[PDB]
């Protein structure tokens, strides 16, 4: 499985209200990973620095996505942390284009193996091809989201 060894809990799903900034989105998604010892305690600082310099916004349709992460040396155990944003938040375009990406779904990655990153990227880009699934993410509650993503991780 592309998602072999990736840890995922109900507590790794949260909704973030419209007030939250990009930095605080990153901090919020990092928070449960830090509590579970999945990453170093300043993990969010490093993801913020990464995002500022090498952004992770993907201009996919119909719902914009970002995939914030940092160096594998800051990761202790593999995890993904998912955020649903109440309103679009601009991330910069990963491919370096000038126009911002209005993002609603954030997949924070904590991967200990650099050589596994493209596997997880592949899974994300696969999962999001389901336009109906992406729409459901915007209306489902945290329990529903967990089960939906868990199923797609499991097989």
């Amino acid at each position: 499985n592309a998602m072999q060894g990736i840890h995922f809990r109900r507590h790794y799903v949260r909704h973030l209200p419209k007030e939250v900034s990009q930095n605080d989105i990153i901090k919020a998604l990092a928070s449960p990973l830090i509590n579970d010892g999945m990453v170093v305690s300043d993990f969010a600082d490093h993801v913020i620095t990464r995002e500022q310099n090498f952004p992770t916004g993907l201009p996919v349709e119909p719902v914009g996505v970002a995939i914030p992460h940092t160096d594998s040396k800051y990761v202790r155990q593999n995890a993904i942390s998912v955020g649903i944003l109440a309103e679009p938040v601009n991330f910069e375009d990963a491919g370096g284009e000038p126009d911002p990406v209005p993002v609603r779904v954030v997949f924070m990655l904590a991967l200990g193996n650099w050589f596994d990153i493209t596997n997880v990227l592949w899974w994300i880009m696969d999962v999001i091809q389901d336009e109906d699934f992406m729409q459901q993410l915007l209306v489902m509650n945290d329990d529903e989201i967990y089960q939906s993503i868990y199923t797609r991780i499991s097989e």
């Epitope: 594998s72 193996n113 050589f115 990227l121 592949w122």
Partner: antibody
Framework: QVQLVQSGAEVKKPGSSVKVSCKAS????????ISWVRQAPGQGLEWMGG????????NYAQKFQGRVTITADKSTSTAYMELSSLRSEDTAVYYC????????????????????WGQGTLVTVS | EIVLTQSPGTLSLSPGERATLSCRAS???????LAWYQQKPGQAPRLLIY???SRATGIPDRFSGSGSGTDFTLTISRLEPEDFAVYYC?????????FGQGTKVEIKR
């Protein structure tokens, strides 16, 4: 049938820098991992670092951190390796390499292992 | 780092014979992250095996990968003169990827 084509051999003076190119064709550029691997004459393979172009920044082996810069340019489907402050010990053939995939099409699941290799670029330091 | 140690350093065998190459890791490596390459003189390495036992596209059955944990093996059956090469194992279970020092396979008359 991804093809990786590298720039030509260079003779370099001690202390200088060299930038080697690796143009990738016949498959997807942005979302698959490209590595750089060096081989001193008569010696073994050393992984220097790698880049997933869409995410912009490279990962480096610490032996090469701060002397090697690895970049990618999507407009030309080309990856680069720049080595600075060249010494005698940097004389080598430098290879780019790219992971394989499975399944049909150009967007299949990646395998990590280096299915595709450039022809190598010889750098001698005089 | 993780050290891969290959044995023997050189293997001299007759054509037609069965060759066994060993790659030993200093700590356990998940089988998903172990590859074998063949490098013929003047060529780039050629991927033979990935994830310990999966043959790469176009690789014939006479190249076979096996093992787990700290001990992996590449077996070459019906050895050919054209198999003259250095064979490398590689782990990519974390950065940096590390390579074995290689086994040089020579084919006698």
């Amino acid at each position: 049938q991804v093809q990786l084509v590298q720039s030509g051999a260079e003779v370099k003076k001690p202390g200088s820098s060299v930038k080697v190119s690796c143009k990738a064709s016949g498959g997807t550029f942005s979302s698959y991992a490209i590595s750089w691997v060096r081989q001193a004459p008569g010696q073994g393979l050393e992984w220097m670092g790698g880049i997933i172009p869409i995410f912009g920044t490279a990962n480096y082996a610490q032996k090469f951190q701060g002397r090697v810069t690895i970049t990618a340019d999507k407009s030309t489907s080309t990856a680069y390796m720049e080595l600075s402050s060249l010494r005698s010990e940097d004389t080598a053939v430098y290879y780019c390499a790219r992971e394989g995939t499975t399944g049909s099409g150009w967007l299949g699941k990646p395998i990590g292992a280096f299915a595709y290799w450039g022809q190598g670029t010889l750098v001698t330091v005089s | 780092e993780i050290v891969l140690t290959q044995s023997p350093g050189t293997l001299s065998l007759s054509p037609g014979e069965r060759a066994t190459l060993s790659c030993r890791a200093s700590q356990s490596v998940s089988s998903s992250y172990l590859a074998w390459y063949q490098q013929k003189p003047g060529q780039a390495p050629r991927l033979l095996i990935y994830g310990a036992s999966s043959r790469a596209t176009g690789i014939p059955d006479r190249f076979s990968g096996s093992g787990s944990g700290t001990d992996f093996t590449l077996t070459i059956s019906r050895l050919e003169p054209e198999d003259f090469a250095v064979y490398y194992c590689q782990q990519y279970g974390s950065s940096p990827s590390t390579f074995g020092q290689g086994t040089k396979v020579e084919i006698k008359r």
